[PDB]
Design a protein around this motif. Structure first.
Motif, mmCIF file in Angstrom:
data_model
loop_
_atom_site.group_PDB
_atom_site.id
_atom_site.type_symbol
_atom_site.label_atom_id
_atom_site.label_comp_id
_atom_site.label_asym_id
_atom_site.label_seq_id
_atom_site.Cartn_x
_atom_site.Cartn_y
_atom_site.Cartn_z
ATOM 1 N N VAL A 1 0.823 -1.254 -0.040
ATOM 2 C CA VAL A 1 -0.025 0.137 -0.120
ATOM 3 C C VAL A 1 0.844 1.193 0.072
ATOM 4 O O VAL A 1 1.981 1.164 0.488
ATOM 5 C CB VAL A 1 -1.120 0.111 1.250
ATOM 6 N N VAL A 2 0.182 2.496 -0.546
ATOM 7 C CA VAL A 2 0.814 3.724 -0.289
ATOM 8 C C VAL A 2 0.111 4.510 0.411
ATOM 9 O O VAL A 2 -1.016 4.877 0.425
ATOM 10 C CB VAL A 2 1.346 4.375 -1.480
ATOM 11 N N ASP A 3 0.716 4.919 1.752
ATOM 12 C CA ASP A 3 0.131 5.926 2.457
ATOM 13 C C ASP A 3 0.557 7.344 1.789
ATOM 14 O O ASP A 3 1.934 7.821 1.741
ATOM 15 C CB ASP A 3 0.799 6.024 3.844
ATOM 16 N N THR B 1 -1.040 10.090 3.293
ATOM 17 C CA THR B 1 -1.722 11.310 4.012
ATOM 18 C C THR B 1 -0.709 12.565 4.454
ATOM 19 O O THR B 1 -1.177 13.474 4.229
ATOM 20 C CB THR B 1 -2.239 10.496 5.554
ATOM 21 N N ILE C 1 4.422 0.790 2.154
ATOM 22 C CA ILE C 1 4.552 -0.310 3.183
ATOM 23 C C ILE C 1 3.657 -1.602 2.991
ATOM 24 O O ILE C 1 2.674 -1.689 2.038
ATOM 25 C CB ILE C 1 3.419 0.112 4.469
ATOM 26 N N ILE D 1 1.916 -5.011 3.823
ATOM 27 C CA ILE D 1 0.839 -5.249 4.661
ATOM 28 C C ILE D 1 0.555 -6.998 4.582
ATOM 29 O O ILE D 1 0.403 -7.357 3.387
ATOM 30 C CB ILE D 1 -0.334 -4.799 4.791
ATOM 31 N N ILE D 2 1.562 -7.650 5.422
ATOM 32 C CA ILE D 2 1.160 -9.194 5.243
ATOM 33 C C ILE D 2 -0.119 -9.513 6.071
ATOM 34 O O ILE D 2 -0.415 -9.251 6.961
ATOM 35 C CB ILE D 2 2.324 -9.979 6.081
ATOM 36 N N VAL E 1 -6.651 4.353 -1.080
ATOM 37 C CA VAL E 1 -5.080 3.969 -0.698
ATOM 38 C C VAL E 1 -4.617 3.017 -2.110
ATOM 39 O O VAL E 1 -5.443 1.950 -2.162
ATOM 40 C CB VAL E 1 -5.424 3.169 0.390
#
Ligand code: NI
Ligand code: NI
Ligand code: NI
Ligand code: NI
Lengths: 172, 176
Positions: free
Chosen positions: A69-71, A73, A80, A82-83, A96
């Motif tokens: 994913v790309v944050d 904000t 990031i 995410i497993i 997102v």
């Protein structure tokens, strides 16, 4: 005007249809209309990031997956991993950018909701070398799935498109 | 992460929080925001049918559930029991009157979406004797889920709302 009243058993659907799970996305729609309920296999074969103005829910019935994913904000991006392990529940929010990395012999569920009036999906690639946006394609709001296929395919074919404008890397 | 990047293992959550799923509040909310993702045990029933302008997705992790629906497509209603077995996925469309019956030591996932803003939720009771509509109440937008127990209480404590106009049967908010 009548609706389905027959549940579907995932195991059985899988025992009969797991071959319907086909690259590069490996997904099939169990239910449609208001939500889209997908069952997704692997290994999938893509580096693209989806931007969906609505949220997405992931559950791994079997095996694990990787949701990159790309944050966005804050002022600059955070990339990031995410497993999502077997039995893991996770709700990704609207907008997102995300890139599901799927492995052989795994089974996930993805629930999406229909999109309102004016919220276009996008498909995006990032540069393996500098991580700037290489290419972004906005999806025209219908038959999303065969558009998410004809964009990857058109990416796989267009070398000027796969070339980072910034560092000039050709993205494999 | 100004949003959650942390998935929840349901099996591990269950070992940790099994008791959250006990009556009277048998539903725990795993994820909120756009979608409401709930984990739900039992036993739990009520006489009421919910009417969601949006769809509800059910998935049975452990054991089966009974999803009672009314099909209003034709002249006469059709009261269908949908049995959702362990491992079953089922999509319920918007505006289908429905009433979930959950049993002891079962585990379910329900997924719902946040409503538009111009079509309300309704709660409805059918007569146990003649299956005619006994009472219906429109639910408020802003106050999600609290207007529900408020509407059951209100039904419970008003006998003339609880009485079927047609067969005069005294109806209830819950079994017996
Ligand atoms: Ni997506
Ligand atoms: Ni670059
Ligand atoms: Ni409902
Ligand atoms: Ni009656």
């Amino acid at each position: 005007a009548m609706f389905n009243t027959t549940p579907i058993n995932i195991d059985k659907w899988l025992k009969e249809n797991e071959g319907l799970l086909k690259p590069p996305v490996n997904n099939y729609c169990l239910h449609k209309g208001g939500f889209t309920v997908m069952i997704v296999g692997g290994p999938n074969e893509r580096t693209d990031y989806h931007i969906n103005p609505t949220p997405e829910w992931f559950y791994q019935k079997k095996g694990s997956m990787l949701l990159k994913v790309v944050d966005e904000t804050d002022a600059e991006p955070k990339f990031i991993d995410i497993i999502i392990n077997e039995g893991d529940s996770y709700l990704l929010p609207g907008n997102v950018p995300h890139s599901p990395v799927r492995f052989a012999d795994t089974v996930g569920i993805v629930v999406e909701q229909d999109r309102p009036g004016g919220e276009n999906d996008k498909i995006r690639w990032y540069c393996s070398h500098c991580r700037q946006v290489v290419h972004e394609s906005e999806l025209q709001m219908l038959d999303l799935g065969t558009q998410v296929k004809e964009a990857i395919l058109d990416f796989e074919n267009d070398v000027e498109k796969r070339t980072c404008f910034h560092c000039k890397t050709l993205n494999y």
